[PDB]
Amino acid sequence: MEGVYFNIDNGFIEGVVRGYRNGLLSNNQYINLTQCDTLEDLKLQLSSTDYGNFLSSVSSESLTTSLIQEYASSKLYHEFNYIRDQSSGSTRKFMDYITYGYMIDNVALMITGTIHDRDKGEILQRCHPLGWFDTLPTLSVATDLESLYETVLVDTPLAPYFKNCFDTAEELDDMNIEIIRNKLYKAYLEDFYNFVTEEIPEPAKECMQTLLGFEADRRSINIALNSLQSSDIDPDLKSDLLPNIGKLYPLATFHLAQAQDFEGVRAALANVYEYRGFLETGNLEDHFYQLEMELCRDAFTQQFAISTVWAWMKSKEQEVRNITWIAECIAQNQRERINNYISVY
Amino acid sequence: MATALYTANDFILISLPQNAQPVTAPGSKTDSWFNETLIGGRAFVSDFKIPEFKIGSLDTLIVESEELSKVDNQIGASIGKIIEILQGLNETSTNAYRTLPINNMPVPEYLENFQWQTRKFKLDKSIKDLITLISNESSQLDADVRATYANYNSAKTNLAAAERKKTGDLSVRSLHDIVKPEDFVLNSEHLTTVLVAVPKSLKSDFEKSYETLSKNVVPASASVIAEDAEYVLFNVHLFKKNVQEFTTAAREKKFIPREFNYSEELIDQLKKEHDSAASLEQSLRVQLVRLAKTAYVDVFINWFHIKALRVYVESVLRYGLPPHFNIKIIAVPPKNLSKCKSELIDAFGFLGGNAFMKDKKGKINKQDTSLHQYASLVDTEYEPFVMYIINL
Amino acid sequence: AKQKMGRVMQTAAFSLAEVSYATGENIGYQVQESVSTARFKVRARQENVSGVYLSQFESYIDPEINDFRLTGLGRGGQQVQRAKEIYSRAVETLVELASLQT
Amino acid sequence: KHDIKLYEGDTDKYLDGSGELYVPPSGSVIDDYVRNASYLEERLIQMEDATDQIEVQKNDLEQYRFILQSGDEFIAAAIGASVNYVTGVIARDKVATLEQILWRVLRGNLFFKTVEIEQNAFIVFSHGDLIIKRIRKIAESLDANLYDVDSSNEGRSQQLAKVNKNLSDLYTVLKTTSTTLESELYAIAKELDSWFQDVTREKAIFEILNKSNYDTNRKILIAEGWIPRDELATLQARLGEMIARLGI
Amino acid sequence: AEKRTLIAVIADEDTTTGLLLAGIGQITPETQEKNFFVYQEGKTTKEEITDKFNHFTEERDDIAILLINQHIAENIRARVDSFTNAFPAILEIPSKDHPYDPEKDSVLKRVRKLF
């Protein structure tokens, strides 16, 4: 049941998201765009959408690397940064937390990056609550954990980073890129779960519930596949073990994650999942995308729901990437490797 | 227990010394016990008496077992892929090729008449050459079946791209089978034809607009030559200079032009692509189905050649002398394997160890541990007498 | 061989570029810390082509050298994992062809 | 190294009983203290590495004593070379089973397994002289010391005879090391506290005096004065409320 | 002969990143100086490429083969042409989104005259 509540606040966040979804690239468009190889045709399809605004500005029949990145950055400012500020209540909060959770991977990478020494300025696009002009640099200069805690308290509302810092004190996060990121993701998915649990009584989660679990299963099998034949430390959570309702089990994920080859698991898991277990790294990669792409669209059937807006954000990240992938091939007159091969969005 | 079960019988291959006597039935005969006593008499025994071979020395013997284990597993895997290539092709559906003939003799009937095959594998040859010949044959055959199934999958992809071009969805499609000399004019160079892919809503919008898109647009040319669900495909004739104005004007209205001229070579080559793609997939599929079936039999004869060899050499390693062994293939009816395996262990187990023996049952395959894999190259759990479990 | 290397280098470069942009972080920074060895190296030989000794090279891939840890980033990690595999194949081309140049 | 732990919170005074005793009322000469610690640092580093190298060799040869004696008796091939024996130590008879399991699966029953309890486990495998390397591969992978012949000392006939004289060198050479270390330990424990207090006191003088610009932009007055030494005592009694009366 | 087993790179950022992942170059553990040089197209002055050129060819000696992008190699045309040695090898390959040109290829010019 949803729409069994009257909300001043939910009404604003839901309409503004619907307003964007109108001009937004449909499933049919993406299907048309792969077929293309004509420079002019790619422009036309896109001119007409939310992304089309930026395309019009500088008119380029062959789209280079830079143009694509600039258009996506522009597009995340109107759609995500802005929206939060004219939104209020529990609905603005839910948007802040999803944006901040994405920020925790980006900012974590910037901090870790200082330790390695690296060049900074503009950092590649993600959905972040405030740009790289506000929050991310202020967090970045503190590499000292003690000062991290203090810097999060200045941010009103609080970031997740405050908990993440508590943890890295007691050394449950260790060092090295791969292990940290696996723990940051484990927390990320854990926060999704706590929110649904509080949120559910007035806007139910049906479509969202199925998508959140299928997303979780995919993320974890993917992390495991990555650390299969590359080295894996067995007592660490580099297997991405996290609660589940029984769709993916801790045992079956652990078997895959270690270096012993455990391709079988994927096949047994699938009965309606796209990924079915293959010997081709590339074919696995294709399937992952299509699965996670489905059920977001289904979520749109619901409305007046926390379910709708969540599924939409996660679809947007997958569309910005599709645009990039297709656009570049057509530019230098080649066809797509991953996108031409996938056919279900 | 199982690993690719259809309706095929499961087999246990055993070998024993000629002094061995069961302790489960004392004073009884081994040959009689297998048929009569063994899992309530529902045990069907078939001969499978493997000849003598050239056995190496003691140092060479360790190395002969190590290789038999590896090669055995390769052949076993590779056959598993061939069965799969068929299953996917729909050449194995209900049951096919696990009970089907093996040179005009079914699989269970073939094992009973299998005693060693002197097809090219000789006992005047060394052991070493027998492992190298059989294994090479098995690898090479799998590689050809794999190369054709890859090529067939590619070939399907080309044909699918082609049908859609020849009619389906417009975004890359240009028509070439619906040509006509007047709905498609180009014979000098003054007139040309531009085709316009128009969404259904927009169909009225095109019929009204067509004349205004550029100057010198031929009258009443706008007709739907072809129509699909999402789109309606129009032809309009106009002057060549004007084609640039026409196309740009078309894109403002929010149509999508599809450029195709009526050059003779164009029409012919697209048509050709459809045909050439159907002929490639067709020829290939017939050779490919045939090639796997022919490969399947050969890798079957070769899988059993290693096992026979493997079992023989092993028997020599574990019991010692006599080099003359009493060897059988026992057909177990499906799901009685565990009960069969246990009974054999109790009777015969004392021979190979009076303390190196424990009760065990069935066959479990894993990469969790290396234990329970019954092999002489990796550490496993030691069986009390030579017994190998075959799952079909 | 110049034309052939160029096609291979542009194709491997574009697949790597796509991946860098999709993940939303620059992989190359991550990659620069981890590079501290080289898998593909050359071993030098002098070869008599007529009376004169010319430099020839024969390439070796170290099998004692593990995969670097730039994977496990989540969904972004899958993308790098596929990426290195095309690139090791590609890079081998450039070196084997390069032996004639010297 | 000494297994004496640091005493701290520091005496630098001349009020105290210890203050007078472990810190001389005289001046300090940095050069002397550096040279004193130099000689001791060098001696220890030799002593510590030498105890470990000598000690390890001894523990092994004493272990392989009993091993070569038992293994020769188990006889008519004690100094043989046409028969292969494998003598070996293993931590416990439990670890030995796992070895037995590899052997039996991967090499056949070409062993005779015997075991004697030590204090460790003496395990013995006995084999052909042309299947050695394969046994060796098993032995390496489960952490066993099964060597063909244990010890690099074999050279008298019997093997053991050489081993027993080399075990008498090892025992007496370790003991001499222990004595030099002990002697020096009793000698310098007390001295180390005194030099430590002395060195603290040197840091403090330099700081008082201004040895860097920072001490300067934090306190700007440094005064001078003369205190009789028979009265040095009373000045140190009150350390100074926000004044440093640590002196020479 | 053997005294060199690194392949150094002067190339655009993506091409270089890729090449390193594949394992060719390195950041040394006792010089702490890169044995590759990344380039931001048009954003990096022609003078910085030249320092880096000298570095791989002369100031380093563990460089076997020097790879260099045609777009970049052209900017610093003078220095490349003047380098005629075989130790390290100069091999110009097309830049990213740039096609072959025989005249961005230092060696091909050299060979053509005085054949």
Side-chain angles (χ1 to χ4, degrees):
Chain A
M1 305 307 259
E2 51 277 295
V4 280
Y5 64 108
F6 272 133
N7 206 354
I8 321 170
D9 321 304
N10 188 241
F12 189 85
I13 192 71
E14 188 53 88
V16 68
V17 163
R18 288 177 297 154
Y20 283 131
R21 204 192 317 174
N22 303 331
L24 231 51
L25 298 93
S26 59
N27 311 313
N28 187 42
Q29 200 182 114
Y30 283 132
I31 296 163
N32 300 143
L33 284 162
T34 45
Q35 269 168 309
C36 293
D37 193 65
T38 302
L39 271 65
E40 201 164 60
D41 284 353
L42 163 59
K43 169 161 273 275
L44 180 69
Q45 295 187 63
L46 284 173
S47 64
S48 302
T49 59
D50 306 85
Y51 190 100
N53 302 96
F54 322 108
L55 190 63
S56 304
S57 289
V58 45
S59 265
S60 302
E61 291 290 280
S62 175
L63 290 171
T64 55
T65 71
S66 299
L67 310 170
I68 300 166
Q69 304 316 295
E70 295 170 299
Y71 308 156
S73 294
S74 286
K75 197 173 63 162
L76 308 185
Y77 308 138
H78 308 138
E79 299 186 349
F80 291 108
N81 287 50
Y82 178 57
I83 60 161
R84 302 159 66 271
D85 295 307
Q86 286 295 357
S87 193
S88 289
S90 298
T91 64
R92 166 171 189 140
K93 305 296 102 178
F94 180 67
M95 195 52 62
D96 305 348
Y97 289 133
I98 320 304
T99 52
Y100 259 114
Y102 263 134
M103 200 189 91
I104 296 322
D105 308 292
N106 199 272
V107 88
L109 282 156
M110 290 163 70
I111 292 160
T112 283
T114 317
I115 300 160
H116 302 332
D117 286 303
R118 72 155 64 153
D119 308 307
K120 297 185 199 76
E122 170 161 60
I123 312 284
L124 303 164
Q125 57 309 99
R126 251 179 189 144
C127 274
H128 297 315
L130 288 314
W132 297 286
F133 324 108
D134 287 267
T135 44
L136 297 97
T138 316
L139 278 177
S140 191
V141 290
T143 55
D144 294 299
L145 302 174
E146 308 297 282
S147 319
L148 276 175
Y149 306 94
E150 316 281 87
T151 317
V152 178
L153 307 152
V154 182
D155 296 306
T156 295
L158 302 176
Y161 220 41
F162 182 84
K163 305 167 177 153
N164 306 129
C165 186
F166 190 59
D167 303 337
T168 45
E170 322 295 293
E171 189 79 313
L172 293 166
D173 281 340
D174 306 285
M175 300 188 79
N176 183 246
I177 309 173
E178 193 184 320
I179 322 196
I180 295 158
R181 245 51 63 195
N182 288 335
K183 302 270 163 70
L184 291 173
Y185 276 90
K186 184 181 83 296
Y188 193 27
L189 292 182
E190 187 70 60
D191 70 52
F192 289 150
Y193 292 144
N194 302 310
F195 307 150
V196 158
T197 301
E198 299 172 31
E199 299 189 286
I200 187 160
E202 311 290 76
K205 284 69 206 303
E206 173 181 342
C207 286
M208 188 188 160
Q209 198 81 279
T210 50
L211 185 51
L212 174 52
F214 274 36
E215 178 173 66
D217 293 40
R218 167 268 191 241
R219 195 79 73 237
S220 309
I221 287 281
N222 195 110
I223 294 170
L225 165 66
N226 291 338
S227 40
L228 178 79
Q229 307 298 110
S230 303
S231 194
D232 200 64
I233 301 311
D234 286 77
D236 277 318
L237 294 160
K238 284 175 75 179
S239 297
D240 213 44
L241 302 186
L242 74 187
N244 283 97
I245 196 164
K247 288 187 285 182
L248 182 53
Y249 294 100
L251 310 188
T253 319
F254 194 64
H255 300 178
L256 193 51
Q258 56 189 131
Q260 285 187 337
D261 301 294
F262 249 103
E263 304 195 320
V265 307
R266 300 193 280 249
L269 199 285
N271 278 259
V272 296
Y273 292 83
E274 303 297 306
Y275 52 99
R276 305 222 167 204
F278 299 95
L279 306 146
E280 195 86 59
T281 292
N283 285 166
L284 295 147
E285 182 181 52
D286 266 95
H287 280 145
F288 285 157
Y289 281 143
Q290 295 171 251
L291 182 67
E292 189 160 65
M293 194 69 185
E294 263 281 82
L295 301 168
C296 307
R297 323 309 301 196
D298 295 52
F300 304 137
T301 306
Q302 291 176 348
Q303 214 69 260
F304 218 73
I306 283 305
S307 305
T308 305
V309 302
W310 193 68
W312 192 84
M313 184 168 163
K314 290 300 153 57
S315 203
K316 277 242 85 314
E317 299 275 275
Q318 306 271 87
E319 289 186 300
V320 163
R321 151 198 78 71
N322 308 311
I323 298 155
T324 304
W325 201 291
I326 287 161
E328 201 69 5
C329 312
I330 297 174
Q332 290 82 31
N333 292 108
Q334 285 158 102
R335 295 297 270 293
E336 320 71 49
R337 288 87 160 184
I338 320 294
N339 274 243
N340 203 60
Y341 195 109
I342 69 184
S343 283
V344 167
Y345 307 92
Chain B
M1 297 311 312
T3 206
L5 190 65
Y6 281 90
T7 191
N9 294 336
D10 299 305
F11 284 88
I12 292 181
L13 171 60
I14 38 73
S15 191
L16 291 166
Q18 287 181 338
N19 51 255
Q21 296 184 45
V23 294
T24 312
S28 191
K29 186 68 172 75
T30 303
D31 286 357
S32 280
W33 197 79
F34 296 142
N35 302 52
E36 286 294 292
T37 307
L38 200 72
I39 44 169
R42 302 181 290 279
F44 175 73
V45 180
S46 302
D47 288 53
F48 194 92
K49 288 186 166 55
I50 318 177
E52 202 193 271
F53 300 109
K54 303 177 181 185
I55 316 297
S57 290
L58 196 58
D59 57 280
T60 317
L61 182 66
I62 322 303
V63 170
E64 281 169 54
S65 294
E66 284 170 82
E67 305 183 355
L68 279 161
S69 309
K70 186 262 185 162
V71 308
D72 190 72
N73 195 211
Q74 182 268 314
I75 308 171
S78 71
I79 204 168
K81 318 165 65 52
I82 287 158
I83 291 171
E84 215 73 72
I85 283 159
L86 297 161
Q87 188 55 54
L89 267 169
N90 303 333
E91 309 310 269
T92 291
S93 291
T94 38
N95 179 231
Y97 313 93
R98 261 305 193 194
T99 304
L100 288 189
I102 306 299
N103 307 71
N104 321 118
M105 189 167 312
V107 174
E109 190 164 83
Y110 197 60
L111 318 199
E112 174 169 55
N113 301 124
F114 199 121
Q115 317 282 308
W116 192 237
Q117 301 295 307
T118 55
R119 27 178 283 172
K120 62 172 172 189
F121 305 110
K122 315 294 176 185
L123 315 180
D124 37 71
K125 280 171 49 185
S126 309
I127 179 159
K128 304 312 304 202
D129 294 74
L130 282 167
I131 292 155
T132 292
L133 191 64
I134 297 160
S135 192
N136 193 287
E137 185 189 336
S138 300
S139 73
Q140 183 181 89
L141 274 167
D142 195 38
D144 283 284
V145 195
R146 280 179 283 184
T148 39
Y149 189 56
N151 291 312
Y152 179 62
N153 303 324
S154 173
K156 205 159 188 187
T157 322
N158 293 148
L159 181 50
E163 292 174 54
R164 299 182 296 134
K165 311 182 49 158
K166 187 168 182 96
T167 185
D169 296 296
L170 296 144
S171 216
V172 65
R173 152 184 162 209
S174 289
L175 242 293
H176 49 277
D177 67 270
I178 198 68
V179 285
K180 253 158 284 198
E182 280 156 302
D183 299 358
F184 284 93
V185 180
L186 173 54
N187 309 119
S188 289
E189 62 288 289
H190 290 293
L191 294 168
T192 49
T193 320
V194 175
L195 299 171
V196 192
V198 173
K200 306 291 288 298
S201 42
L202 295 193
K203 182 182 184 236
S204 297
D205 214 62
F206 191 76
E207 290 179 315
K208 300 177 178 75
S209 69
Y210 75 117
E211 308 194 0
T212 210
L213 299 170
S214 63
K215 304 196 294 294
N216 314 300
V217 182
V218 178
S221 297
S223 301
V224 274
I225 42 172
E227 179 161 297
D228 62 271
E230 207 64 51
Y231 291 87
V232 280
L233 175 54
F234 285 83
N235 56 296
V236 173
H237 297 270
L238 43 142
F239 191 82
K240 64 173 183 299
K241 179 265 193 69
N242 297 79
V243 168
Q244 307 308 303
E245 316 165 33
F246 178 93
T247 56
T248 304
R251 289 194 167 67
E252 293 182 289
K253 304 260 182 306
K254 311 311 290 198
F255 316 148
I256 297 172
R258 285 309 300 121
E259 292 305 285
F260 180 73
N261 307 116
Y262 181 62
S263 301
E264 204 63 51
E265 173 51 30
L266 299 182
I267 291 171
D268 278 306
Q269 196 180 310
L270 298 180
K271 196 173 63 167
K272 190 51 83 158
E273 177 171 311
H274 182 232
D275 303 342
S276 59
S279 299
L280 191 78
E281 199 189 316
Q282 194 58 237
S283 300
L284 179 74
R285 193 194 298 114
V286 174
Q287 280 166 78
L288 160 63
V289 301
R290 173 188 59 58
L291 191 57
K293 286 160 190 168
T294 50
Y296 175 71
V297 297
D298 281 291
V299 175
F300 203 78
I301 300 152
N302 294 355
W303 196 28
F304 282 72
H305 276 295
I306 302 288
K307 288 173 181 309
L309 188 67
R310 178 166 193 222
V311 163
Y312 201 77
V313 163
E314 188 64 42
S315 287
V316 172
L317 175 62
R318 284 183 172 173
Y319 298 134
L321 296 182
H324 286 294
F325 299 115
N326 182 40
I327 323 177
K328 285 302 179 56
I329 203 179
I330 303 197
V332 183
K335 299 284 190 278
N336 278 244
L337 289 82
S338 288
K339 187 185 287 310
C340 190
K341 175 157 188 306
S342 302
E343 286 187 273
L344 291 172
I345 271 179
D346 192 62
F348 300 123
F350 77 111
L351 299 165
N354 294 90
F356 298 170
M357 169 180 20
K358 298 158 182 295
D359 188 70
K360 297 183 166 53
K361 57 183 179 185
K363 178 65 163 56
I364 313 288
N365 305 264
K366 58 192 55 168
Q367 290 186 292
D368 291 289
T369 181
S370 300
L371 311 177
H372 318 270
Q373 204 62 251
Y374 325 132
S376 297
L377 158 72
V378 298
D379 193 52
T380 60
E381 281 310 302
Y382 182 72
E383 309 158 294
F385 89 94
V386 177
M387 173 162 38
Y388 288 95
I389 317 285
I390 312 194
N391 300 123
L392 304 185
Chain C
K2 288 167 174 180
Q3 292 177 74
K4 200 171 309 175
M5 285 177 262
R7 294 182 288 249
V8 170
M9 190 230 74
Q10 291 152 251
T11 65
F14 308 133
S15 288
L16 192 286
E18 272 158 12
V19 164
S20 189
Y21 307 145
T23 176
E25 187 51 274
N26 200 68
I27 70 189
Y29 302 138
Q30 311 187 31
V31 171
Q32 288 171 34
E33 181 280 304
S34 72
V35 65
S36 299
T37 57
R39 293 173 73 203
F40 289 102
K41 299 196 191 195
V42 281
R43 186 173 69 262
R45 172 189 58 182
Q46 307 307 108
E47 189 183 58
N48 280 129
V49 179
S50 301
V52 74
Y53 272 106
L54 296 184
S55 305
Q56 296 292 145
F57 289 112
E58 302 84 57
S59 309
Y60 51 101
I61 329 184
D62 288 85
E64 53 166 292
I65 290 177
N66 67 298
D67 308 298
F68 298 140
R69 296 195 171 177
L70 304 154
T71 204
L73 315 169
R75 54 294 184 286
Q78 179 62 27
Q79 301 184 31
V80 208
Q81 187 192 17
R82 176 49 166 161
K84 49 172 176 84
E85 297 196 329
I86 300 156
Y87 230 118
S88 54
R89 303 178 197 160
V91 70
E92 285 161 12
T93 306
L94 293 176
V95 187
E96 284 292 291
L97 289 160
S99 180
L100 304 167
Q101 186 53 260
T102 323
Chain D
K1 297 165 201 293
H2 297 329
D3 293 285
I4 293 302
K5 307 315 186 193
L6 194 66
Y7 308 99
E8 67 294 92
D10 319 295
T11 296
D12 295 275
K13 292 93 202 57
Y14 296 116
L15 174 284
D16 307 311
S18 294
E20 293 191 48
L21 278 168
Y22 287 89
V23 185
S26 319
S28 38
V29 173
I30 300 170
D31 294 298
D32 200 70
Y33 303 139
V34 167
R35 286 177 64 79
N36 300 321
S38 291
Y39 302 137
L40 304 172
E41 181 66 58
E42 269 182 49
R43 289 175 196 156
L44 271 296
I45 290 163
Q46 287 318 106
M47 282 173 192
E48 290 301 313
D49 296 314
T51 290
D52 306 322
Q53 287 175 55
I54 289 148
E55 188 184 304
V56 174
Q57 303 169 274
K58 189 255 291 174
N59 178 260
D60 286 78
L61 205 43
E62 190 181 318
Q63 195 184 255
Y64 282 146
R65 183 170 49 175
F66 189 85
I67 264 52
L68 300 159
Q69 189 172 51
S70 288
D72 298 350
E73 172 58 68
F74 286 3
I75 193 53
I79 54 166
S82 301
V83 203
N84 184 59
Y85 37 104
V86 206
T87 46
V89 180
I90 190 42
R92 204 65 277 161
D93 284 279
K94 300 294 279 167
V95 195
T97 314
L98 311 167
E99 293 138 52
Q100 202 181 29
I101 296 177
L102 273 81
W103 291 95
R104 72 173 79 145
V105 174
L106 310 174
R107 314 286 164 224
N109 290 14
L110 298 171
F111 52 85
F112 188 115
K113 181 172 191 63
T114 50
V115 274
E116 267 191 307
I117 305 175
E118 296 295 297
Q119 292 82 49
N120 299 317
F122 176 34
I123 35 174
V124 189
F125 296 97
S126 297
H127 281 295
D129 302 56
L130 285 166
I131 41 151
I132 316 192
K133 307 310 302 164
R134 309 169 174 83
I135 61 171
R136 198 60 256 272
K137 292 162 189 310
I138 303 179
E140 262 185 296
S141 61
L142 298 171
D143 305 88
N145 294 327
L146 290 158
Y147 310 130
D148 283 328
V149 169
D150 289 341
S151 307
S152 274
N153 283 339
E154 309 174 28
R156 274 177 183 164
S157 298
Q158 307 298 105
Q159 298 167 220
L160 186 77
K162 185 68 180 56
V163 148
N164 277 10
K165 183 209 73 67
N166 203 83
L167 190 53
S168 299
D169 304 315
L170 298 163
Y171 285 174
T172 46
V173 69
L174 193 55
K175 181 72 176 291
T176 293
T177 333
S178 315
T179 299
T180 58
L181 183 67
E182 276 165 56
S183 282
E184 182 175 0
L185 205 146
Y186 307 124
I188 69 181
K190 298 306 189 177
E191 296 185 337
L192 278 210
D193 304 308
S194 314
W195 294 320
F196 173 61
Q197 291 177 21
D198 294 321
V199 156
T200 298
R201 178 173 56 112
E202 299 180 328
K203 186 174 170 192
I205 284 170
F206 298 150
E207 210 177 66
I208 294 173
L209 286 165
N210 304 342
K211 55 170 178 48
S212 285
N213 292 128
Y214 307 126
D215 301 346
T216 305
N217 48 254
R218 183 180 65 188
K219 293 179 178 173
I220 59 175
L221 192 65
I222 311 91
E224 198 170 50
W226 296 82
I227 208 303
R229 282 186 296 153
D230 299 307
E231 292 171 55
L232 210 59
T234 49
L235 186 50
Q236 287 286 1
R238 183 179 291 264
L239 297 158
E241 317 183 287
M242 290 91 174
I243 308 94
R245 307 182 192 206
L246 287 167
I248 315 166
Chain E
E2 186 164 28
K3 52 179 198 296
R4 48 182 62 210
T5 54
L6 284 298
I7 296 185
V9 175
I10 286 167
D12 69 273
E13 189 172 81
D14 290 279
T15 305
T16 314
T17 284
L19 286 169
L20 295 166
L21 218 177
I24 47 147
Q26 70 180 83
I27 298 186
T28 41
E30 56 172 297
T31 296
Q32 298 200 333
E33 171 74 293
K34 296 194 173 303
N35 301 49
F36 57 93
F37 171 71
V38 298
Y39 183 82
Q40 280 81 53
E41 301 274 312
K43 261 155 174 69
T44 299
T45 57
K46 300 184 184 63
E47 66 188 336
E48 325 183 356
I49 327 166
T50 307
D51 288 317
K52 295 281 191 173
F53 188 102
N54 288 61
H55 205 50
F56 301 129
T57 51
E58 287 197 284
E59 309 170 62
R60 279 183 174 289
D61 293 298
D62 57 300
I63 308 311
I65 287 166
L66 175 50
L67 305 167
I68 179 168
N69 290 354
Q70 282 179 11
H71 172 283
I72 311 186
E74 181 60 57
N75 303 124
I76 49 165
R77 180 72 281 154
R79 180 58 186 131
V80 197
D81 303 315
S82 56
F83 201 74
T84 61
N85 297 114
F87 290 81
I90 34 174
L91 171 55
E92 295 63 40
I93 65 174
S95 188
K96 177 185 165 306
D97 181 23
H98 283 264
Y100 179 84
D101 298 302
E103 310 299 310
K104 307 177 148 165
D105 295 347
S106 202
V107 197
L108 181 46
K109 288 194 270 300
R110 280 162 49 208
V111 163
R112 198 187 302 113
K113 57 181 162 304
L114 277 52
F115 200 110

